[PDB]
Amino acid sequence: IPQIGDKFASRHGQKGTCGIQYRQEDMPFTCEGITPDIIINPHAIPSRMTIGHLIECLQGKVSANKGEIGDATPFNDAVNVQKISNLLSDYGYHLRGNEVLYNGFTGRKITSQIFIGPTYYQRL
Amino acid sequence: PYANQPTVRITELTDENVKFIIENTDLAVANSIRRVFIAEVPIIAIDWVQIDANSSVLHDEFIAHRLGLIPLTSDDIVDKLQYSRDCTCEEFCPECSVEFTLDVRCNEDQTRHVTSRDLISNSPRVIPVTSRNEQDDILIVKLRKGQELRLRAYAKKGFGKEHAKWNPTAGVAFEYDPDNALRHTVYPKPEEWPKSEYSELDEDESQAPYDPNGKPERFYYNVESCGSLRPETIVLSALSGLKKKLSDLQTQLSHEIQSD
Amino acid sequence: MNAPPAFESFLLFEGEKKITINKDTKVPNACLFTINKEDHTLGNIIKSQLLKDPQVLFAGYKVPHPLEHKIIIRVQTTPDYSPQEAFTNAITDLISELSLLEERFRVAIKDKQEG
Amino acid sequence: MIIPVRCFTCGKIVGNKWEAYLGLLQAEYTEGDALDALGLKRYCCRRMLLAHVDLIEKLLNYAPLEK
Amino acid sequence: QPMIYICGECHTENEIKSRDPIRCRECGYRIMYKKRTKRLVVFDAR
Numbered sequence: 001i002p003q004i005g006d007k008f009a010s011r012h013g014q015k016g017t018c019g020i021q022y023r024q025e026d027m028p029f030t031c032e033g034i035t036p037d038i039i040i041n042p043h044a045i046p047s048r049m050t051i052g053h054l055i056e057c058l059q060g061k062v063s064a065n066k067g068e069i070g071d072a073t074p075f076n077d078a079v080n081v082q083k084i085s086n087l088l089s090d091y092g093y094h095l096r097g098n099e100v101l102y103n104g105f106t107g108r109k110i111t112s113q114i115f116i117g118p119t120y121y122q123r124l
Numbered sequence: 125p126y127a128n129q130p131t132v133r134i135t136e137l138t139d140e141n142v143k144f145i146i147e148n149t150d151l152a153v154a155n156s157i158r159r160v161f162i163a164e165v166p167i168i169a170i171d172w173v174q175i176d177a178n179s180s181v182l183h184d185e186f187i188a189h190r191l192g193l194i195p196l197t198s199d200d201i202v203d204k205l206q207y208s209r210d211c212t213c214e215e216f217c218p219e220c221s222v223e224f225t226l227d228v229r230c231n232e233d234q235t236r237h238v239t240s241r242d243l244i245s246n247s248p249r250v251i252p253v254t255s256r257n258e259q260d261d262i263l264i265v266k267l268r269k270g271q272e273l274r275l276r277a278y279a280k281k282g283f284g285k286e287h288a289k290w291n292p293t294a295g296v297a298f299e300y301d302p303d304n305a306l307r308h309t310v311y312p313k314p315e316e317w318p319k320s321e322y323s324e325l326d327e328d329e330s331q332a333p334y335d336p337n338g339k340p341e342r343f344y345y346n347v348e349s350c351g352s353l354r355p356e357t358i359v360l361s362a363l364s365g366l367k368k369k370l371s372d373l374q375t376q377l378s379h380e381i382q383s384d
Numbered sequence: 385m386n387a388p389p390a391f392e393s394f395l396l397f398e399g400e401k402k403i404t405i406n407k408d409t410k411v412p413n414a415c416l417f418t419i420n421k422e423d424h425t426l427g428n429i430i431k432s433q434l435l436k437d438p439q440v441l442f443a444g445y446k447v448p449h450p451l452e453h454k455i456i457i458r459v460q461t462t463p464d465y466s467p468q469e470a471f472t473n474a475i476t477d478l479i480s481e482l483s484l485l486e487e488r489f490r491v492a493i494k495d496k497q498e499g
Numbered sequence: 500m501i502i503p504v505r506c507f508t509c510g511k512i513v514g515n516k517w518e519a520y521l522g523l524l525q526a527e528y529t530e531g532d533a534l535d536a537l538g539l540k541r542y543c544c545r546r547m548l549l550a551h552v553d554l555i556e557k558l559l560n561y562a563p564l565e566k
Numbered sequence: 567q568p569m570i571y572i573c574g575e576c577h578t579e580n581e582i583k584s585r586d587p588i589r590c591r592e593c594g595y596r597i598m599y600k601k602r603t604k605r606l607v608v609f610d611a612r
């Protein structure tokens with residue numbers, strides 16, 4: 001059973017161990033009570049420049065809301081971020097994949113709208 | 125220095141969810157109610173399995189874990205049953221547990237779907253939700269000709285703090301201040317964000333004018349039930365459980381104050 | 385290997401007190417309530433109810449470690465008042481609020497099912 | 500290998516929807532319309548049904564250990 | 567005492583004693599599997 005110290009990775013070089021596990025009432029939630037399965041730190045993105053992670057998260061939100069499988073083939077001019085954002089704005093979501101989350105401990109809104117969505121993770 | 129006088133307004137009540145609004149309460153009370161929906165509303169769930177025979181392609185712990193997550197109707201029985209911690213019996217008794225039996229064998233050529241309908245209980249009140257008298261039955265395992273699964277489960281009383289299988293909710297939507305009047309969020313581009321279903325704003329207006337003297341009131345809830353409890357039973361049991369947590373805390377507080 | 389049982393978040397160990405009151409010596413009329421086997425669910429409501437008392441000068445809580453299963457609530461009141469009395473009144477007020485909320489939710493459910 | 504019982508995120512039951520989902524797909528529903536027919540409105544449960552790979556059907560191609 | 571095994575190919579329940587070559591009596595297959603114990607193993611459905 002996964003636990004603190006088990007190594008997980010996305011498909012973009014974003015590896016890390018489980019720091020802690022919070023129950024569903026302790027995790028942050030959207031207005032429709034969706035809690036993240038995983039929370040990763042924003043500081044893993046900028047130096048690494050794994051923008052594929054973010055585009056995959058956004059495409060995955062579109063895919064899950066649309067009932068399809070996203071096409072992430074490398075060199076495809078028929079798929080860019082603006083198209084994916086326009087598609088996501090049609091399902092009642094912020095076009096860039098952000099959502100207002102609430103603090104699970106206090107229930108107050110988090111001032112900064114969080115970037116959340118489906119991403120394929122791997123257990124190593 | 126005294127309590128709130130909250131009011132309630134239920135805007136939708138089905139067998140699947142309850143959508144309501146609590147007004148004139150603190151955000152901490154609203155979020156503790158929301159948390160108790162998930163983590164301190166007891167229900168009945170399988171928490172003990174004895175596999176007598178399993179020739180299926182899923183190992184024993186797979187089947188056991190899978191049985192634990194089947195919701196069992198807990199409406200009137202959960203209040204009566206005791207925690208096995210509190211029961212003065214041996215490992216089990218009908219006062220703290222419910223016995224289930226499952227015995228399936230695939231003799232025919234087509235795949236046999238061992239579903240929650242095959243979980244036979246000794247208690248008629250505590251049965252799998254899908255088996256209750258549409259939605260199909262939860263699939264425990266598929267069996268091939270010659271494969272067989274025979275087990276004996278016991279279901280216990282617990283809540284979501286111990287394991288998510290004792291969580292009665294299939295999602296708790298919680299919201300407040302749909303128009304960002306308290307500015308607890310700060311949209312870099314307020315025009316880009318969709319409107320809440322509870323918003324009262326004309327489409328040209330993106331968010332409400334900032335309310336400096338405002339406090340979070342009017343919390344909107346949509347408590348979806350996994351099936352074990354009715355959604356309104358989830359809310360009532362949540363309020364009762366939170367009140368008994370506070371009552372026990374006050375009892376222990378009084379003992380500590382008087383002992384000093 | 386090192387996984388604590390899930391009940392350890394809710395259940396008191398033998399000989400472990402649910403709540404302990406310790407006088408805070410830094411400032412007068414302040415106390416620390418160390419409550420075992422509770423979490424943000426009760427801490428947040430108790431703190432926020434204590435903040436509604438004008439005789440309460442400080443009301444805060446913390447979970448010192450998420451892996452541990454206790455909370456500490458610090459309460460400072462005015463000299464004519466007591467932090468123990470403030471904590472008691474906060475719990476009483478929360479109980480009354482929840483009782484009223486429960487009765488009103490029962491009434492609302494009855495209205496919704498009937499008409 | 501088999502359809503999960505609950506949605507990992509919310510805890511909604513999805514175990515009883517795999518067979519209905521497949522029956523809707525052979526009924527010439529799109530995956531989105533099929534997921535709408537089963538009442539999976541949160542994209543977490545849509546993720547559960549839409550990304551599931553029924554490996555148990557391949558594990559049932561092997562004869563069991565006992566006849 | 568009997569230690570009945572199952573055949574990997576013919577799935578036949580056959581008894582084999584110690585100091586005996588591992589051979590199924592029904593088809594001669596050389597790989598055998600032990601049967602599930604009768605002991606009582608308990609699972610917390612978690």
Ligand SMILES: [Zn+2]
Pocket residue numbers: 208211212213214215216217218219220221
């Ligand atoms: Zn008992």
Ligand SMILES: [Zn+2]
Pocket residue numbers: 506507508509510511541543544545
């Ligand atoms: Zn879900």
Ligand SMILES: [Zn+2]
Pocket residue numbers: 573574575576577578590591592593594595
């Ligand atoms: Zn043989």
